[PDB]
Amino acid sequence: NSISGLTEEQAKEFHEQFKTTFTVFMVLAAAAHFLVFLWRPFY
Amino acid sequence: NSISGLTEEQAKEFHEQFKTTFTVFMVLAAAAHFLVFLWRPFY
Amino acid sequence: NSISGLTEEQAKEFHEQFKTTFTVFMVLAAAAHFLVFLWRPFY
Amino acid sequence: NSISGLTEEQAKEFHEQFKTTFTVFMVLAAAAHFLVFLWRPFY
Amino acid sequence: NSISGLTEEQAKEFHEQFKTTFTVFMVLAAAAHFLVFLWRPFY
Amino acid sequence: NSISGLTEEQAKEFHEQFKTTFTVFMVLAAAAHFLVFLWRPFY
Amino acid sequence: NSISGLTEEQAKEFHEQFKTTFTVFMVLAAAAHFLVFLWRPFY
Amino acid sequence: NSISGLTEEQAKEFHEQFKTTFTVFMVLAAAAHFLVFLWRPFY
Amino acid sequence: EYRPSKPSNPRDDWKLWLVVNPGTWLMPILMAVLVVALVVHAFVYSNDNYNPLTF
Amino acid sequence: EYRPSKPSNPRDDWKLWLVVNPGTWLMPILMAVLVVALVVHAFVYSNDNYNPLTF
Amino acid sequence: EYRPSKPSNPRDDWKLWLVVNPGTWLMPILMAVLVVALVVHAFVYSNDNYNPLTF
Amino acid sequence: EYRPSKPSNPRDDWKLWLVVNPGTWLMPILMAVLVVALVVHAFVYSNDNYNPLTF
Amino acid sequence: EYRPSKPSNPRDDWKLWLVVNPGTWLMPILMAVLVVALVVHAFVYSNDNYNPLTF
Amino acid sequence: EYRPSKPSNPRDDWKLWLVVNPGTWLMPILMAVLVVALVVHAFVYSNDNYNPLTF
Amino acid sequence: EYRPSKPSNPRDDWKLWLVVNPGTWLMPILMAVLVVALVVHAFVYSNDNYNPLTF
Amino acid sequence: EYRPSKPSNPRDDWKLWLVVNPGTWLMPILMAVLVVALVVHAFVYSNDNYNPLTF
């Protein structure tokens, strides 16, 4: 009877993929910031 | 027969997480304001 | 058979909280206007 | 079988409050225009 | 079985009020254009 | 079993009015372009 | 049991008209680019 | 009982076309970047 | 097959409401007209000659 | 066939709510009016003569 | 398997309304056209030579 | 026929929620008020005299 | 488990309408294309060399 | 007839979710807050003194 | 209690469509990508060096 | 009456999806993040020092 309508199992499986993709997005963003800093320092 | 459709228990559980996350957001925002003030004072 | 679907009791309870929150918002806004006027007069 | 789904009685009661609130809004707006004209004439 | 769901009678009654209101809007707009032209000619 | 839900007869009747109104819109637009060209040539 | 709800026959008939209209749009766009290039070359 | 309502088979078939189209979009975008670089170098 | 008769306007204009449910569309129509009035005012008001602000 | 009677306004104005459900449309109406007030303020406030910011 | 016949336009144009429900889409279509007219006016009106504001 | 009684405000104000379902409209109302606060801030903040940015 | 066959385009293109209901999406698609045309016109028209306004 | 008791805040704050379904409104709330952060950043970032872009 | 297995990407990528119904979301996805292309073009086109308008 | 236990984050984070249906909200979340990226790019790209357009 969840607010979303998802089962616990669905929520956990969804969360596991979300975390994986989010982590890769953040790693790529961190790399992008490193490169942009080498190209054009800020602060 | 709530307007939202949530049970009391759901509303209270939702509120408990909301408060936790809100509190951390506000602490981080306060830290951000402190740092920005050290970097570039305002007023 | 209300247009909103709310009972009288729900509408009155909702209104009571609305008035409370609205009142505090307005008091805070009034304080904000007082402070801003002390900081930077207008008119 | 109204397009809106309202009864005649609901439409009339709704209209009565609408007219009351609209009238007060217009009176306040008229006062605002009078004051703004005293402060800064236009035309 | 109309696309809108309105009866012929509802459509005709709706149209009659629409025409009345539209006509008054257009008369007022025409008056507005006349006055604005007296105040500030255009073309 | 049309995608829109309209009968053939409804679609044809709708199309007939659409074409009539569209045609008058285009004639008026053509007249407008003629007048604007007389007033202020373009190209 | 299609995601859209369309039958194969509906999808194919829809696609046939889409392709026809798209093709004429593209031919007209190509003509427009040719004329604009004659009027005002670009690149 | 998928969140989307799609079967596994539908999701896989959808994904196969998505990947094909995405791949062609990316190849075209890569070609576009190559040409734009030849026309007007950047960095 | 079926051929539609030529409509007569404005006699047949009321048939708009057999297509367009005014329950859904009257307020959007009036809001659309309001948007036009705002945009027209924005252009005309922007000319200093055509606005009342004289102080 | 059926011919509608000429409405009398403002006597028949309440019949708006037989078409427009205020449950759906009252808040959008009030938001539309708010948008107008914001846009009017934007034009008038933009004139330095008509705004309170004097410091 | 099934092969669709080539449509003939404008003869088959009415079949648009077998896809697009004008109950839903007529007002959005007309609003879209209004938006185009506003945008075209914005560009043309912005040229001082093409607007009536002469005072 | 039926004649509505004159409402008494603010006594009858709670009847707003018999029309407007706060389940649907409370968050839009609060977002509308937020938009007003943002727009007011945009105008006032734009004046250099009324903003804290002093560095 | 189940492996999808490689699609052949443009042969399989009609299968778009097995996913996308044109009843819902055709008008939004056409409005999206209109928006592109407006934006392209805005950029090109803004160049005085590429617009017809010559008076 | 019925008179509502005075609420006690923040004790009664959880009752917001008896009105506002967070299934519908949590993401819009968070997007609204994001919009505020973007707008605040737009104003502050626009001041050259308060942005990191130093190259 | 239940612990989800670590997904393998891109092998498990097709499971996106078990969450996101492409019937609803494919056109919005493509419109989102179009918006990005328009915004990127707006920035790049705005540089006179990077646009074809040479007349 | 009922008292909620203090949540533990990030252990309890998966419970977001018991509130927020990702079928409805994943694409809006990703579009919101895209909007942020566009806005950040707009600010940074606007600085000539931080954009690749060098010709």
Ligand code: BCL
């Ligand atoms: C403005 C100053 C710098 C610059 C500094 C930065 C910095 C710093 C960053 C970027 C980032 C981005 N830049 Mg940049 N960038 C510049 C100029 C450009 C130009 C241009 C026209 O010149 C373009 C087109 C871009 C485009 C991009 C995007 C590729 C990316 C933002 C993606 C996004 O929307 O995330 C938000 C949108 C979403 C999250 C929605 C979903 C998108 C997809 C589905 C993400 C899922 C992740 C998944 C695991 C990917 C798997 C694939 C492979 C592992 C790669 N940049 C200049 C040179 N740019 C960001 C980035 O790299 O992010 C990783 C970033 O941190």
Ligand code: BCL
């Ligand atoms: C908000 C909605 C849900 C929730 C849903 C999720 C979901 C969904 C996810 C998480 C994830 C996380 N959650 Mg959670 N989470 C919730 C509430 C919480 C609470 C809390 C006390 O309420 C906590 C402590 C956490 C904690 C966490 C982290 C363990 C993790 C994110 C790590 C990360 O992003 O780095 C912080 C990163 C940044 C702050 C951005 C960094 C960008 C940098 C700064 C780029 C700038 C560099 C450049 C050079 C600039 C110069 C220097 C500058 C001056 C800085 N969550 C609630 C219940 N949470 C993620 C996870 O588990 O991943 C494995 C994940 O996918």
Ligand code: BCL
């Ligand atoms: C403009 C002048 C200063 C600056 C001064 C400030 C100040 C002051 C603040 C920020 C804040 C933010 N700044 Mg800044 N900032 C600057 C330049 C930048 C640049 C840049 C391109 O240079 C970027 C990308 C940012 C980006 C950011 C964001 C990371 C953050 C706003 C988040 C938000 O949208 O909250 C609103 C959106 C939401 C609430 C939606 C949900 C977002 C998530 C899910 C929040 C949940 C919280 C959860 C508990 C997190 C768990 C994870 C871990 C505990 C970390 N800043 C410069 C240097 N910045 C704010 C911040 O730090 O907030 C904490 C803040 O107070």
Ligand code: BCL
């Ligand atoms: C521009 C000139 C002045 C300035 C003059 C003013 C004046 C005057 C006012 C503000 C107000 C506000 N200013 Mg300011 N402000 C300035 C610069 C800033 C800067 C900045 C980046 O420099 C920021 C981030 C802000 C931010 C704010 C907000 C905190 C607040 C508007 C809230 C709102 O959206 O209400 C509208 C949105 C809603 C109503 C939506 C719901 C919001 C919440 C949920 C309200 C519920 C109330 C509830 C009872 C709160 C309980 C908590 C505790 C009792 C506190 N100001 C400068 C210094 N500012 C206003 C304020 O204080 O309001 C009280 C106000 O009157």
Ligand code: BCL
């Ligand atoms: C720009 C030149 C003048 C100025 C000239 C005017 C003039 C002239 C007018 C205003 C009006 C308004 N001005 Mg001003 N105003 C100025 C500067 C400001 C500043 C500022 C930051 O300096 C602010 C915040 C405002 C704010 C306001 C609002 C309070 C009001 C518009 C309300 C509205 O949105 O109606 C539209 C929105 C709605 C109708 C939505 C619903 C709002 C509520 C619910 C209305 C219901 C009415 C109900 C009966 C109220 C009962 C309560 C009590 C009886 C009071 N002004 C300067 C000094 N201002 C207008 C006004 O007073 O209206 C009455 C008006 O006519």
Ligand code: BCL
């Ligand atoms: C810009 C140059 C001129 C000017 C020239 C004109 C000209 C010319 C016109 C206006 C019109 C209007 N102007 Mg002006 N106007 C000026 C400056 C202003 C200023 C200002 C801040 O200075 C304001 C607030 C206005 C405001 C207005 C509105 C009252 C009106 C547009 C209404 C509308 O949105 O219709 C569109 C919206 C709708 C149709 C939505 C529904 C609105 C209501 C419900 C209409 C129903 C009609 C009904 C029968 C009314 C019954 C009531 C009584 C019979 C009156 N003007 C200056 C002085 N103005 C127009 C007008 O008068 O229209 C009649 C018009 O033609």
Ligand code: BCL
């Ligand atoms: C900018 C340079 C020129 C100018 C050149 C042109 C040119 C060229 C054209 C216009 C057109 C229009 N101009 Mg101009 N125009 C100028 C200045 C103005 C000013 C002003 C404030 O100065 C205003 C208010 C207008 C207003 C208008 C509109 C009346 C019209 C666009 C309608 C529309 O939105 O169609 C799009 C919206 C829709 C299709 C939505 C539905 C609208 C209705 C319902 C259409 C149905 C048609 C139906 C058969 C009508 C029956 C009624 C009677 C037969 C009349 N112009 C200056 C002087 N203008 C256009 C026009 O005349 O169109 C016919 C046109 O081609």
Ligand code: BCL
């Ligand atoms: C800016 C520089 C040039 C210019 C260069 C170009 C170039 C190059 C092009 C245009 C195109 C267009 N220009 Mg231009 N154009 C200029 C100035 C103008 C002015 C003006 C006010 O001066 C106007 C009003 C226009 C208007 C137009 C439109 C008629 C057309 C975009 C339609 C569209 O939105 O497609 C997008 C919208 C949709 C696809 C939505 C649906 C529209 C309809 C239903 C399409 C269906 C097609 C169907 C088969 C048509 C059947 C009818 C008959 C066979 C004709 N141009 C100047 C002179 N213009 C384009 C065009 O001709 O397209 C064919 C084009 O390629």
Ligand code: BCL
């Ligand atoms: C601004 C600097 C350069 C320039 C540099 C670039 C660069 C670099 C790129 C473009 C790209 C594009 N440019 Mg450019 N471009 C310039 C000037 C222009 C002008 C103009 C008025 O001068 C126009 C109209 C365009 C138009 C375009 C589009 C055709 C294309 C973006 C499509 C899109 O929205 O993808 C996003 C939208 C979607 C993905 C939505 C769906 C669109 C369709 C359905 C995609 C499906 C793919 C499918 C497999 C196609 C099958 C057909 C055939 C195999 C071809 N450019 C100048 C000369 N241009 C991009 C491109 O080529 O992409 C491939 C690209 O990378």
Ligand SMILES: COC(C)(C)C/C=C/C(C)=C/C=C/C(C)=C/C=C/C(C)=C/C=C/C=C(C)/C=C/C=C(C)/C=C/C=C(\C)CCC=C(C)C
């Ligand atoms: C049963 O069988 C079935 C189901 C019927 C089978 C049928 C299947 C069918 C028909 C299936 C069709 C499926 C189809 C058409 C797929 C189509 C897929 C495409 C075309 C993908 C494309 C994606 C592209 C992306 C993501 C792009 C991201 C860009 C991003 C983020 C940039 C961000 C940029 C910045 C911020 C920088 C900004 C800098 C500034 C402003 C200077």
